[PDB]
Amino acid sequence: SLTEIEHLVQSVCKSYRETCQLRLEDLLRQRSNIFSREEVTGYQRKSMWEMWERCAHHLTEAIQYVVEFAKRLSGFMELCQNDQIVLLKAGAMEVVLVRMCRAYNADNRTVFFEGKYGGMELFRALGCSELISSIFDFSHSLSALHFSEDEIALYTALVLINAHRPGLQEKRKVEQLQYNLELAFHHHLCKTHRQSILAKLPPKGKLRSLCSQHVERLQIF
Ligand SMILES: O=S(=O)(c1ccccc1)N(CC(F)(F)F)c1ccc(C(O)(C(F)(F)F)C(F)(F)F)cc1
Numbered sequence: 275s276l277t278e279i280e281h282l283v284q285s286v287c288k289s290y291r292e293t294c295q296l297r298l299e300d301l302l303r304q305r306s307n308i309f310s311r312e313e314v315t316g317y318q319r320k321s322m323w324e325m326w327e328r329c330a331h332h333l334t335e336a337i338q339y340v341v342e343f344a345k346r347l348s349g350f351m352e353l354c355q356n357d358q359i360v361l362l363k364a365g366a367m368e369v370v371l372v373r374m375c376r377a378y379n380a381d382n383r384t385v386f387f388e389g390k391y392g393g394m395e396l397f398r399a400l401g402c403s404e405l406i407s408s409i410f411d412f413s414h415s416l417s418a419l420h421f422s423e424d425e426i427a428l429y430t431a432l433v434l435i436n437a438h439r440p441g442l443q444e445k446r447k448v449e450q451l452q453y454n455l456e457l458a459f460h461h462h463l464c465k466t467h468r469q470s471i472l473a474k475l476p477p478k479g480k481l482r483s484l485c486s487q488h489v490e491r492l493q494i495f
Pocket of ligand 1: 328329330332333334336370371374385386387397405406409488489491492
């Protein structure tokens with residue numbers, strides 16, 4: 275019914291609030307805390323290897339919270355061990371990317387990274403301009419939509435629970451789950467007068483195309 279769906283919305287948003295890693299109020303009030311021209315040089319002078327192993331640490335950490343988010347998600351636990359791993363190893367990464375836009379400031383084109391805010395010149399040492407630019411451009415486009423926490427909660431759930439991932443065994447059951455989440459998302463945008471964000475959402479395939487490029491560069495190192 276309908277009450278079930280309102281419950282599902284509430285259920286999903288609680289799970290995100292508990293597992294958002296960084297509170298929005300902390301990220302917003304620290305927007306004035308910017309790296310000095312000296313501190314950026316410090317990061318710029320580091321080696322690829324140090325810089326890669328730092329970023330890979332923050333990512334793994336972020337993925338832990340995404341995993342904890344998936345576990346609190348209604349229906350996910352009921353799935354088999356195979357489909358759980360299929361959905362996670364495909365989408366955990368994609369969720370992390372979506373989550374990142376909260377840490378992005380469009381006013382000065384900076385991102386929160388290890389305590390302070392800094393532009394993309396901070397990652398010079400990684401040696402991959404195009405990849406970093408992708409991340410910033412993607413976050414910038416998502417930041418203009420002013421995603422609420424609940425919108426992020428519901429959207430990331432749908433990113434993660436997708437019945438189009440190859441190698442699913444219990445496909446029919448993942449469809450059912452996705453379904454209810456789609457409805458929950460649409461219901462809530464209606465309740466909040468935010469139906470507008472749908473047409474402004476990233477096209478399906480974009481998220482996946484980004485991740486696939488990021489994972490390939492990463493596996494090198
Ligand atoms: O905090 S991060 O290191 C970060 C990287 C770049 C810009 C801002 C923040 N981290 C973001 C996270 F949400 F995971 F904390 C992050 C680390 C590494 C990446 C990479 O995409 C990849 F491929 F290594 F996973 C890349 F290193 F390529 F940038 C992406 C994001």
